[PDB]
PDB file of all heavy atoms in Angstrom:
ATOM      1  N   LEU I   1     -26.152 -21.055  -0.008  1.00 11.80           N
ATOM      2  CA  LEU I   1     -27.147 -20.652   0.974  1.00 11.80           C
ATOM      3  C   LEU I   1     -27.302 -21.739   2.022  1.00 11.80           C
ATOM      4  O   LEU I   1     -26.838 -22.875   1.847  1.00 11.80           O
ATOM      5  CB  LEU I   1     -28.503 -20.279   0.343  1.00 11.80           C
ATOM      6  CG  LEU I   1     -29.655 -21.240   0.052  1.00 11.80           C
ATOM      7  CD1 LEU I   1     -30.961 -20.465   0.038  1.00 11.80           C
ATOM      8  CD2 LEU I   1     -29.447 -21.914  -1.266  1.00 11.80           C
ATOM      9  N   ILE I   2     -27.870 -21.355   3.153  1.00 14.75           N
ATOM     10  CA  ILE I   2     -28.081 -22.275   4.243  1.00 14.75           C
ATOM     11  C   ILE I   2     -29.530 -22.188   4.683  1.00 14.75           C
ATOM     12  O   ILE I   2     -30.105 -21.099   4.727  1.00 14.75           O
ATOM     13  CB  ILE I   2     -27.175 -21.928   5.426  1.00 14.75           C
ATOM     14  CG1 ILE I   2     -25.711 -22.047   4.995  1.00 14.75           C
ATOM     15  CG2 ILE I   2     -27.478 -22.847   6.605  1.00 14.75           C
ATOM     16  CD1 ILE I   2     -24.712 -21.703   6.077  1.00 14.75           C
ATOM     17  N   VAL I   3     -30.149 -23.339   4.924  1.00 15.59           N
ATOM     18  CA  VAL I   3     -31.527 -23.353   5.385  1.00 15.59           C
ATOM     19  C   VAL I   3     -31.696 -24.270   6.583  1.00 15.59           C
ATOM     20  O   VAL I   3     -31.218 -25.402   6.597  1.00 15.59           O
ATOM     21  CB  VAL I   3     -32.553 -23.640   4.244  1.00 15.59           C
ATOM     22  CG1 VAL I   3     -31.987 -24.581   3.232  1.00 15.59           C
ATOM     23  CG2 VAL I   3     -33.852 -24.174   4.812  1.00 15.59           C
ATOM     24  N   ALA I   4     -32.253 -23.700   7.638  1.00 13.01           N
ATOM     25  CA  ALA I   4     -32.503 -24.422   8.868  1.00 13.01           C
ATOM     26  C   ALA I   4     -34.008 -24.635   8.948  1.00 13.01           C
ATOM     27  O   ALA I   4     -34.779 -23.676   8.925  1.00 13.01           O
ATOM     28  CB  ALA I   4     -32.016 -23.611  10.048  1.00 13.01           C
ATOM     29  N   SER I   5     -34.430 -25.891   9.004  1.00 12.87           N
ATOM     30  CA  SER I   5     -35.848 -26.210   9.071  1.00 12.87           C
ATOM     31  C   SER I   5     -36.245 -27.005  10.308  1.00 12.87           C
ATOM     32  O   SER I   5     -35.431 -27.722  10.899  1.00 12.87           O
ATOM     33  CB  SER I   5     -36.282 -26.925   7.798  1.00 12.87           C
ATOM     34  OG  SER I   5     -35.299 -27.842   7.365  1.00 12.87           O
ATOM     35  N   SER I   6     -37.508 -26.862  10.691  1.00 14.57           N
ATOM     36  CA  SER I   6     -38.047 -27.525  11.861  1.00 14.57           C
ATOM     37  C   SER I   6     -39.326 -28.282  11.494  1.00 14.57           C
ATOM     38  O   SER I   6     -40.083 -27.833  10.630  1.00 14.57           O
ATOM     39  CB  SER I   6     -38.363 -26.468  12.916  1.00 14.57           C
ATOM     40  OG  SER I   6     -39.089 -27.002  14.006  1.00 14.57           O
ATOM     41  N   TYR I   7     -39.556 -29.425  12.143  1.00 17.17           N
ATOM     42  CA  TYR I   7     -40.764 -30.224  11.915  1.00 17.17           C
ATOM     43  C   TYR I   7     -41.579 -30.247  13.192  1.00 17.17           C
ATOM     44  O   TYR I   7     -42.512 -31.031  13.330  1.00 17.17           O
ATOM     45  CB  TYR I   7     -40.439 -31.660  11.508  1.00 17.17           C
ATOM     46  CG  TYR I   7     -39.849 -31.803  10.132  1.00 17.17           C
ATOM     47  CD1 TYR I   7     -38.500 -32.089   9.963  1.00 17.17           C
ATOM     48  CD2 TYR I   7     -40.648 -31.680   8.998  1.00 17.17           C
ATOM     49  CE1 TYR I   7     -37.955 -32.246   8.704  1.00 17.17           C
ATOM     50  CE2 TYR I   7     -40.120 -31.839   7.733  1.00 17.17           C
ATOM     51  CZ  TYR I   7     -38.767 -32.126   7.593  1.00 17.17           C
ATOM     52  OH  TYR I   7     -38.233 -32.306   6.335  1.00 17.17           O
ATOM     53  N   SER I   8     -41.243 -29.346  14.106  1.00 17.32           N
ATOM     54  CA  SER I   8     -41.929 -29.243  15.376  1.00 17.32           C
ATOM     55  C   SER I   8     -43.409 -28.905  15.240  1.00 17.32           C
ATOM     56  O   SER I   8     -44.257 -29.541  15.873  1.00 17.32           O
ATOM     57  CB  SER I   8     -41.245 -28.190  16.244  1.00 17.32           C
ATOM     58  OG  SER I   8     -39.899 -28.549  16.472  1.00 17.32           O
ATOM     59  N   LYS I   9     -43.714 -27.895  14.425  1.00 18.82           N
ATOM     60  CA  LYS I   9     -45.088 -27.447  14.212  1.00 18.82           C
ATOM     61  C   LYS I   9     -45.871 -28.256  13.196  1.00 18.82           C
ATOM     62  O   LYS I   9     -46.946 -28.764  13.509  1.00 18.82           O
ATOM     63  CB  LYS I   9     -45.132 -25.970  13.806  1.00 18.82           C
ATOM     64  CG  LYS I   9     -45.144 -24.985  14.960  1.00 18.82           C
ATOM     65  CD  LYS I   9     -43.789 -24.901  15.678  1.00 18.82           C
ATOM     66  CE  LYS I   9     -42.652 -24.484  14.743  1.00 18.82           C
ATOM     67  NZ  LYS I   9     -41.323 -24.413  15.431  1.00 18.82           N
ATOM     68  N   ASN I  10     -45.336 -28.402  11.985  1.00 19.19           N
ATOM     69  CA  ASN I  10     -46.065 -29.133  10.957  1.00 19.19           C
ATOM     70  C   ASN I  10     -46.248 -30.628  11.183  1.00 19.19           C
ATOM     71  O   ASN I  10     -47.015 -31.267  10.474  1.00 19.19           O
ATOM     72  CB  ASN I  10     -45.557 -28.805   9.533  1.00 19.19           C
ATOM     73  CG  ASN I  10     -44.090 -29.124   9.318  1.00 19.19           C
ATOM     74  OD1 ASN I  10     -43.520 -28.749   8.300  1.00 19.19           O
ATOM     75  ND2 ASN I  10     -43.476 -29.825  10.250  1.00 19.19           N
ATOM     76  N   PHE I  11     -45.554 -31.183  12.170  1.00 17.04           N
ATOM     77  CA  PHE I  11     -45.690 -32.599  12.496  1.00 17.04           C
ATOM     78  C   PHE I  11     -46.085 -32.786  13.963  1.00 17.04           C
ATOM     79  O   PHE I  11     -46.237 -33.917  14.425  1.00 17.04           O
ATOM     80  CB  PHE I  11     -44.390 -33.354  12.225  1.00 17.04           C
ATOM     81  CG  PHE I  11     -44.218 -33.785  10.790  1.00 17.04           C
ATOM     82  CD1 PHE I  11     -43.704 -32.909   9.840  1.00 17.04           C
ATOM     83  CD2 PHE I  11     -44.542 -35.084  10.397  1.00 17.04           C
ATOM     84  CE1 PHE I  11     -43.508 -33.313   8.524  1.00 17.04           C
ATOM     85  CE2 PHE I  11     -44.349 -35.498   9.080  1.00 17.04           C
ATOM     86  CZ  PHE I  11     -43.831 -34.607   8.144  1.00 17.04           C
ATOM     87  N   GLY I  12     -46.241 -31.679  14.692  1.00 20.17           N
ATOM     88  CA  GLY I  12     -46.593 -31.751  16.099  1.00 20.17           C
ATOM     89  C   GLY I  12     -45.574 -32.547  16.891  1.00 20.17           C
ATOM     90  O   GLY I  12     -45.911 -33.155  17.904  1.00 20.17           O
ATOM     91  N   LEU I  13     -44.319 -32.515  16.447  1.00 20.82           N
ATOM     92  CA  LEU I  13     -43.217 -33.247  17.078  1.00 20.82           C
ATOM     93  C   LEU I  13     -42.310 -32.392  17.967  1.00 20.82           C
ATOM     94  O   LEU I  13     -41.132 -32.695  18.141  1.00 20.82           O
ATOM     95  CB  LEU I  13     -42.377 -33.930  15.995  1.00 20.82           C
ATOM     96  CG  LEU I  13     -43.042 -35.162  15.371  1.00 20.82           C
ATOM     97  CD1 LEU I  13     -42.267 -35.673  14.170  1.00 20.82           C
ATOM     98  CD2 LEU I  13     -43.144 -36.240  16.437  1.00 20.82           C
ATOM     99  N   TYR I  14     -42.887 -31.364  18.578  1.00 23.96           N
ATOM    100  CA  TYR I  14     -42.165 -30.429  19.435  1.00 23.96           C
ATOM    101  C   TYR I  14     -41.020 -30.965  20.291  1.00 23.96           C
ATOM    102  O   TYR I  14     -39.863 -30.548  20.133  1.00 23.96           O
ATOM    103  CB  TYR I  14     -43.146 -29.693  20.339  1.00 23.96           C
ATOM    104  CG  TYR I  14     -44.293 -29.046  19.606  1.00 23.96           C
ATOM    105  CD1 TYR I  14     -45.536 -29.679  19.516  1.00 23.96           C
ATOM    106  CD2 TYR I  14     -44.137 -27.809  18.985  1.00 23.96           C
ATOM    107  CE1 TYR I  14     -46.595 -29.087  18.832  1.00 23.96           C
ATOM    108  CE2 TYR I  14     -45.193 -27.206  18.300  1.00 23.96           C
ATOM    109  CZ  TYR I  14     -46.421 -27.854  18.225  1.00 23.96           C
ATOM    110  OH  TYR I  14     -47.494 -27.260  17.593  1.00 23.96           O
ATOM    111  N   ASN I  15     -41.337 -31.881  21.202  1.00 21.60           N
ATOM    112  CA  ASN I  15     -40.332 -32.410  22.119  1.00 21.60           C
ATOM    113  C   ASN I  15     -39.435 -33.554  21.665  1.00 21.60           C
ATOM    114  O   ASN I  15     -38.713 -34.138  22.480  1.00 21.60           O
ATOM    115  CB  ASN I  15     -40.970 -32.751  23.459  1.00 21.60           C
ATOM    116  CG  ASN I  15     -41.940 -33.919  23.378  1.00 21.60           C
ATOM    117  OD1 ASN I  15     -41.888 -34.745  22.462  1.00 21.60           O
ATOM    118  ND2 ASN I  15     -42.822 -34.003  24.356  1.00 21.60           N
ATOM    119  N   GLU I  16     -39.483 -33.902  20.387  1.00 23.20           N
ATOM    120  CA  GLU I  16     -38.627 -34.965  19.877  1.00 23.20           C
ATOM    121  C   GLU I  16     -37.413 -34.361  19.171  1.00 23.20           C
ATOM    122  O   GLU I  16     -36.509 -35.082  18.731  1.00 23.20           O
ATOM    123  CB  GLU I  16     -39.408 -35.911  18.950  1.00 23.20           C
ATOM    124  CG  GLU I  16     -40.565 -36.644  19.626  1.00 23.20           C
ATOM    125  CD  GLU I  16     -40.130 -37.640  20.685  1.00 23.20           C
ATOM    126  OE1 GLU I  16     -38.923 -37.727  21.019  1.00 23.20           O
ATOM    127  OE2 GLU I  16     -41.019 -38.350  21.189  1.00 23.20           O
ATOM    128  N   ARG I  17     -37.414 -33.030  19.077  1.00 21.57           N
ATOM    129  CA  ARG I  17     -36.326 -32.250  18.492  1.00 21.57           C
ATOM    130  C   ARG I  17     -35.938 -32.701  17.107  1.00 21.57           C
ATOM    131  O   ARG I  17     -34.837 -33.184  16.887  1.00 21.57           O
ATOM    132  CB  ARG I  17     -35.108 -32.291  19.424  1.00 21.57           C
ATOM    133  CG  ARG I  17     -35.456 -32.023  20.880  1.00 21.57           C
ATOM    134  CD  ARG I  17     -36.382 -30.820  21.036  1.00 21.57           C
ATOM    135  NE  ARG I  17     -35.725 -29.566  20.675  1.00 21.57           N
ATOM    136  CZ  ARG I  17     -36.295 -28.592  19.971  1.00 21.57           C
ATOM    137  NH1 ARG I  17     -37.545 -28.715  19.547  1.00 21.57           N
ATOM    138  NH2 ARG I  17     -35.610 -27.495  19.680  1.00 21.57           N
ATOM    139  N   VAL I  18     -36.832 -32.493  16.157  1.00 19.88           N
ATOM    140  CA  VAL I  18     -36.579 -32.906  14.792  1.00 19.88           C
ATOM    141  C   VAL I  18     -36.505 -31.695  13.868  1.00 19.88           C
ATOM    142  O   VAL I  18     -37.419 -30.876  13.822  1.00 19.88           O
ATOM    143  CB  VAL I  18     -37.622 -33.994  14.338  1.00 19.88           C
ATOM    144  CG1 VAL I  18     -38.998 -33.704  14.900  1.00 19.88           C
ATOM    145  CG2 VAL I  18     -37.661 -34.120  12.830  1.00 19.88           C
ATOM    146  N   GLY I  19     -35.358 -31.538  13.221  1.00 18.34           N
ATOM    147  CA  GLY I  19     -35.137 -30.422  12.322  1.00 18.34           C
ATOM    148  C   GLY I  19     -33.989 -30.764  11.401  1.00 18.34           C
ATOM    149  O   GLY I  19     -33.460 -31.881  11.461  1.00 18.34           O
ATOM    150  N   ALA I  20     -33.592 -29.825  10.552  1.00 21.80           N
ATOM    151  CA  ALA I  20     -32.507 -30.080   9.622  1.00 21.80           C
ATOM    152  C   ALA I  20     -31.738 -28.816   9.248  1.00 21.80           C
ATOM    153  O   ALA I  20     -32.247 -27.698   9.362  1.00 21.80           O
ATOM    154  CB  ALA I  20     -33.040 -30.750   8.367  1.00 21.80           C
ATOM    155  N   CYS I  21     -30.493 -29.016   8.836  1.00 22.73           N
ATOM    156  CA  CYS I  21     -29.625 -27.937   8.409  1.00 22.73           C
ATOM    157  C   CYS I  21     -29.137 -28.308   7.022  1.00 22.73           C
ATOM    158  O   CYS I  21     -28.377 -29.266   6.864  1.00 22.73           O
ATOM    159  CB  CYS I  21     -28.436 -27.788   9.358  1.00 22.73           C
ATOM    160  SG  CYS I  21     -27.434 -26.336   8.997  1.00 22.73           S
ATOM    161  N   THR I  22     -29.648 -27.611   6.013  1.00 21.20           N
ATOM    162  CA  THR I  22     -29.271 -27.867   4.631  1.00 21.20           C
ATOM    163  C   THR I  22     -28.239 -26.850   4.161  1.00 21.20           C
ATOM    164  O   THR I  22     -28.429 -25.634   4.282  1.00 21.20           O
ATOM    165  CB  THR I  22     -30.502 -27.869   3.718  1.00 21.20           C
ATOM    166  OG1 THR I  22     -31.411 -28.884   4.175  1.00 21.20           O
ATOM    167  CG2 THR I  22     -30.110 -28.176   2.287  1.00 21.20           C
ATOM    168  N   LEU I  23     -27.135 -27.379   3.647  1.00 23.31           N
ATOM    169  CA  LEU I  23     -26.006 -26.594   3.169  1.00 23.31           C
ATOM    170  C   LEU I  23     -25.934 -26.708   1.645  1.00 23.31           C
ATOM    171  O   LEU I  23     -25.944 -27.814   1.103  1.00 23.31           O
ATOM    172  CB  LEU I  23     -24.739 -27.169   3.817  1.00 23.31           C
ATOM    173  CG  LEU I  23     -23.385 -26.465   3.924  1.00 23.31           C
ATOM    174  CD1 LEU I  23     -22.573 -26.706   2.679  1.00 23.31           C
ATOM    175  CD2 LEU I  23     -23.568 -24.986   4.218  1.00 23.31           C
ATOM    176  N   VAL I  24     -25.934 -25.576   0.950  1.00 22.83           N
ATOM    177  CA  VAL I  24     -25.857 -25.597  -0.510  1.00 22.83           C
ATOM    178  C   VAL I  24     -24.603 -24.848  -0.975  1.00 22.83           C
ATOM    179  O   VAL I  24     -24.309 -23.765  -0.473  1.00 22.83           O
ATOM    180  CB  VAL I  24     -27.118 -24.977  -1.158  1.00 22.83           C
ATOM    181  CG1 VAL I  24     -27.008 -25.015  -2.666  1.00 22.83           C
ATOM    182  CG2 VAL I  24     -28.365 -25.729  -0.712  1.00 22.83           C
ATOM    183  N   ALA I  25     -23.840 -25.458  -1.878  1.00 23.82           N
ATOM    184  CA  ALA I  25     -22.623 -24.852  -2.411  1.00 23.82           C
ATOM    185  C   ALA I  25     -22.687 -24.879  -3.934  1.00 23.82           C
ATOM    186  O   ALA I  25     -23.550 -25.544  -4.513  1.00 23.82           O
ATOM    187  CB  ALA I  25     -21.390 -25.585  -1.921  1.00 23.82           C
ATOM    188  N   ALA I  26     -21.763 -24.169  -4.579  1.00 23.03           N
ATOM    189  CA  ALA I  26     -21.722 -24.081  -6.038  1.00 23.03           C
ATOM    190  C   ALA I  26     -21.762 -25.436  -6.741  1.00 23.03           C
ATOM    191  O   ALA I  26     -22.350 -25.570  -7.820  1.00 23.03           O
ATOM    192  CB  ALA I  26     -20.498 -23.292  -6.478  1.00 23.03           C
ATOM    193  N   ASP I  27     -21.130 -26.433  -6.132  1.00 24.35           N
ATOM    194  CA  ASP I  27     -21.098 -27.765  -6.706  1.00 24.35           C
ATOM    195  C   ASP I  27     -20.885 -28.855  -5.661  1.00 24.35           C
ATOM    196  O   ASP I  27     -20.622 -28.572  -4.493  1.00 24.35           O
ATOM    197  CB  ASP I  27     -20.066 -27.857  -7.858  1.00 24.35           C
ATOM    198  CG  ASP I  27     -18.658 -27.377  -7.465  1.00 24.35           C
ATOM    199  OD1 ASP I  27     -17.876 -28.173  -6.909  1.00 24.35           O
ATOM    200  OD2 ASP I  27     -18.312 -26.213  -7.751  1.00 24.35           O
ATOM    201  N   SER I  28     -21.026 -30.099  -6.103  1.00 26.22           N
ATOM    202  CA  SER I  28     -20.878 -31.274  -5.259  1.00 26.22           C
ATOM    203  C   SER I  28     -19.541 -31.378  -4.546  1.00 26.22           C
ATOM    204  O   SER I  28     -19.491 -31.647  -3.352  1.00 26.22           O
ATOM    205  CB  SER I  28     -21.113 -32.530  -6.094  1.00 26.22           C
ATOM    206  OG  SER I  28     -20.612 -33.681  -5.432  1.00 26.22           O
ATOM    207  N   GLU I  29     -18.463 -31.206  -5.296  1.00 26.43           N
ATOM    208  CA  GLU I  29     -17.107 -31.279  -4.768  1.00 26.43           C
ATOM    209  C   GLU I  29     -16.915 -30.294  -3.608  1.00 26.43           C
ATOM    210  O   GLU I  29     -16.368 -30.646  -2.561  1.00 26.43           O
ATOM    211  CB  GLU I  29     -16.124 -30.984  -5.911  1.00 26.43           C
ATOM    212  CG  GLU I  29     -14.687 -31.430  -5.695  1.00 26.43           C
ATOM    213  CD  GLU I  29     -13.869 -30.453  -4.866  1.00 26.43           C
ATOM    214  OE1 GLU I  29     -13.955 -29.226  -5.116  1.00 26.43           O
ATOM    215  OE2 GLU I  29     -13.128 -30.915  -3.971  1.00 26.43           O
ATOM    216  N   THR I  30     -17.392 -29.068  -3.785  1.00 27.87           N
ATOM    217  CA  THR I  30     -17.263 -28.048  -2.749  1.00 27.87           C
ATOM    218  C   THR I  30     -18.255 -28.232  -1.606  1.00 27.87           C
ATOM    219  O   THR I  30     -17.890 -28.048  -0.445  1.00 27.87           O
ATOM    220  CB  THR I  30     -17.315 -26.595  -3.336  1.00 27.87           C
ATOM    221  OG1 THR I  30     -17.585 -25.645  -2.296  1.00 27.87           O
ATOM    222  CG2 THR I  30     -18.370 -26.472  -4.386  1.00 27.87           C
ATOM    223  N   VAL I  31     -19.493 -28.620  -1.909  1.00 27.90           N
ATOM    224  CA  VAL I  31     -20.480 -28.823  -0.847  1.00 27.90           C
ATOM    225  C   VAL I  31     -20.024 -29.944   0.088  1.00 27.90           C
ATOM    226  O   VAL I  31     -20.157 -29.831   1.308  1.00 27.90           O
ATOM    227  CB  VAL I  31     -21.921 -29.114  -1.386  1.00 27.90           C
ATOM    228  CG1 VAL I  31     -22.054 -30.536  -1.906  1.00 27.90           C
ATOM    229  CG2 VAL I  31     -22.934 -28.858  -0.296  1.00 27.90           C
ATOM    230  N   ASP I  32     -19.433 -30.992  -0.483  1.00 24.99           N
ATOM    231  CA  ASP I  32     -18.942 -32.124   0.298  1.00 24.99           C
ATOM    232  C   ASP I  32     -17.823 -31.707   1.241  1.00 24.99           C
ATOM    233  O   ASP I  32     -17.806 -32.082   2.416  1.00 24.99           O
ATOM    234  CB  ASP I  32     -18.446 -33.241  -0.623  1.00 24.99           C
ATOM    235  CG  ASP I  32     -19.577 -33.998  -1.300  1.00 24.99           C
ATOM    236  OD1 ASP I  32     -20.729 -33.958  -0.816  1.00 24.99           O
ATOM    237  OD2 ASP I  32     -19.307 -34.650  -2.323  1.00 24.99           O
ATOM    238  N   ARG I  33     -16.906 -30.899   0.734  1.00 27.21           N
ATOM    239  CA  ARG I  33     -15.781 -30.439   1.528  1.00 27.21           C
ATOM    240  C   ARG I  33     -16.251 -29.552   2.676  1.00 27.21           C
ATOM    241  O   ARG I  33     -15.731 -29.626   3.787  1.00 27.21           O
ATOM    242  CB  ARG I  33     -14.787 -29.712   0.631  1.00 27.21           C
ATOM    243  CG  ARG I  33     -13.441 -29.440   1.272  1.00 27.21           C
ATOM    244  CD  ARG I  33     -12.452 -28.987   0.222  1.00 27.21           C
ATOM    245  NE  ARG I  33     -13.052 -28.009  -0.680  1.00 27.21           N
ATOM    246  CZ  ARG I  33     -12.861 -27.996  -1.992  1.00 27.21           C
ATOM    247  NH1 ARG I  33     -12.074 -28.904  -2.559  1.00 27.21           N
ATOM    248  NH2 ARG I  33     -13.501 -27.112  -2.745  1.00 27.21           N
ATOM    249  N   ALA I  34     -17.256 -28.731   2.422  1.00 31.43           N
ATOM    250  CA  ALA I  34     -17.791 -27.868   3.462  1.00 31.43           C
ATOM    251  C   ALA I  34     -18.640 -28.663   4.474  1.00 31.43           C
ATOM    252  O   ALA I  34     -18.641 -28.352   5.671  1.00 31.43           O
ATOM    253  CB  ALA I  34     -18.614 -26.743   2.839  1.00 31.43           C
ATOM    254  N   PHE I  35     -19.322 -29.714   4.008  1.00 31.70           N
ATOM    255  CA  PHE I  35     -20.176 -30.522   4.874  1.00 31.70           C
ATOM    256  C   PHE I  35     -19.383 -31.282   5.911  1.00 31.70           C
ATOM    257  O   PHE I  35     -19.828 -31.439   7.043  1.00 31.70           O
ATOM    258  CB  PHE I  35     -21.034 -31.493   4.059  1.00 31.70           C
ATOM    259  CG  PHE I  35     -22.215 -32.045   4.822  1.00 31.70           C
ATOM    260  CD1 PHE I  35     -23.122 -31.191   5.448  1.00 31.70           C
ATOM    261  CD2 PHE I  35     -22.432 -33.419   4.901  1.00 31.70           C
ATOM    262  CE1 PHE I  35     -24.220 -31.698   6.140  1.00 31.70           C
ATOM    263  CE2 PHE I  35     -23.524 -33.922   5.586  1.00 31.70           C
ATOM    264  CZ  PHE I  35     -24.419 -33.060   6.206  1.00 31.70           C
ATOM    265  N   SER I  36     -18.199 -31.742   5.530  1.00 34.11           N
ATOM    266  CA  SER I  36     -17.334 -32.466   6.457  1.00 34.11           C
ATOM    267  C   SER I  36     -17.049 -31.587   7.682  1.00 34.11           C
ATOM    268  O   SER I  36     -17.068 -32.071   8.821  1.00 34.11           O
ATOM    269  CB  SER I  36     -16.024 -32.874   5.769  1.00 34.11           C
ATOM    270  OG  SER I  36     -15.174 -31.764   5.520  1.00 34.11           O
ATOM    271  N   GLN I  37     -16.833 -30.292   7.454  1.00 33.81           N
ATOM    272  CA  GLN I  37     -16.569 -29.362   8.547  1.00 33.81           C
ATOM    273  C   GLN I  37     -17.829 -29.089   9.342  1.00 33.81           C
ATOM    274  O   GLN I  37     -17.748 -28.687  10.498  1.00 33.81           O
ATOM    275  CB  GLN I  37     -15.961 -28.050   8.039  1.00 33.81           C
ATOM    276  CG  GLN I  37     -14.554 -28.193   7.497  1.00 33.81           C
ATOM    277  CD  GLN I  37     -13.512 -28.507   8.572  1.00 33.81           C
ATOM    278  OE1 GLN I  37     -13.848 -28.824   9.711  1.00 33.81           O
ATOM    279  NE2 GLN I  37     -12.246 -28.425   8.206  1.00 33.81           N
ATOM    280  N   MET I  38     -18.996 -29.271   8.722  1.00 33.01           N
ATOM    281  CA  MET I  38     -20.266 -29.084   9.426  1.00 33.01           C
ATOM    282  C   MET I  38     -20.500 -30.304  10.325  1.00 33.01           C
ATOM    283  O   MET I  38     -21.049 -30.189  11.418  1.00 33.01           O
ATOM    284  CB  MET I  38     -21.431 -28.931   8.455  1.00 33.01           C
ATOM    285  CG  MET I  38     -22.753 -28.698   9.170  1.00 33.01           C
ATOM    286  SD  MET I  38     -24.126 -28.293   8.083  1.00 33.01           S
ATOM    287  CE  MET I  38     -23.893 -26.533   7.852  1.00 33.01           C
ATOM    288  N   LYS I  39     -20.071 -31.473   9.863  1.00 34.01           N
ATOM    289  CA  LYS I  39     -20.206 -32.692  10.637  1.00 34.01           C
ATOM    290  C   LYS I  39     -19.268 -32.615  11.837  1.00 34.01           C
ATOM    291  O   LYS I  39     -19.613 -33.046  12.935  1.00 34.01           O
ATOM    292  CB  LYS I  39     -19.909 -33.907   9.761  1.00 34.01           C
ATOM    293  CG  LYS I  39     -21.107 -34.323   8.927  1.00 34.01           C
ATOM    294  CD  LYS I  39     -20.712 -34.939   7.609  1.00 34.01           C
ATOM    295  CE  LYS I  39     -20.076 -36.290   7.777  1.00 34.01           C
ATOM    296  NZ  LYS I  39     -19.655 -36.840   6.448  1.00 34.01           N
ATOM    297  N   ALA I  40     -18.093 -32.024  11.639  1.00 35.94           N
ATOM    298  CA  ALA I  40     -17.131 -31.858  12.731  1.00 35.94           C
ATOM    299  C   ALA I  40     -17.716 -30.955  13.829  1.00 35.94           C
ATOM    300  O   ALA I  40     -17.480 -31.173  15.016  1.00 35.94           O
ATOM    301  CB  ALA I  40     -15.826 -31.275  12.204  1.00 35.94           C
ATOM    302  N   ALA I  41     -18.487 -29.951  13.428  1.00 31.29           N
ATOM    303  CA  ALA I  41     -19.127 -29.034  14.376  1.00 31.29           C
ATOM    304  C   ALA I  41     -20.201 -29.766  15.196  1.00 31.29           C
ATOM    305  O   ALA I  41     -20.430 -29.452  16.372  1.00 31.29           O
ATOM    306  CB  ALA I  41     -19.754 -27.847  13.626  1.00 31.29           C
ATOM    307  N   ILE I  42     -20.904 -30.695  14.540  1.00 29.16           N
ATOM    308  CA  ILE I  42     -21.944 -31.494  15.184  1.00 29.16           C
ATOM    309  C   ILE I  42     -21.299 -32.474  16.156  1.00 29.16           C
ATOM    310  O   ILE I  42     -21.733 -32.598  17.302  1.00 29.16           O
ATOM    311  CB  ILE I  42     -22.769 -32.289  14.153  1.00 29.16           C
ATOM    312  CG1 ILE I  42     -23.576 -31.331  13.278  1.00 29.16           C
ATOM    313  CG2 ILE I  42     -23.675 -33.282  14.865  1.00 29.16           C
ATOM    314  CD1 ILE I  42     -24.103 -31.957  12.023  1.00 29.16           C
TER     315      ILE I  42
END
């Protein structure tokens, strides 16, 4: 699963652009391999 979160409202940090993209995979070995491609996208 994938979860995109924002701290804009709960921290009143609207214009500092603070959020996160959490990637979950079946296991560590696979999540790591998929994360590298997510870092490449960033």
Side-chain angles (χ1 to χ4, degrees):
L1 89 155
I2 298 179
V3 34
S5 40
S6 171
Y7 290 106
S8 300
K9 274 72 59 181
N10 59 190
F11 276 84
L13 286 171
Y14 308 98
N15 68 22
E16 298 293 6
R17 313 314 293 138
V18 38
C21 187
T22 301
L23 198 274
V24 180
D27 53 85
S28 163
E29 199 278 315
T30 163
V31 76
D32 286 340
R33 192 168 44 221
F35 198 53
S36 71
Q37 291 291 11
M38 182 172 277
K39 278 149 70 182
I42 293 164

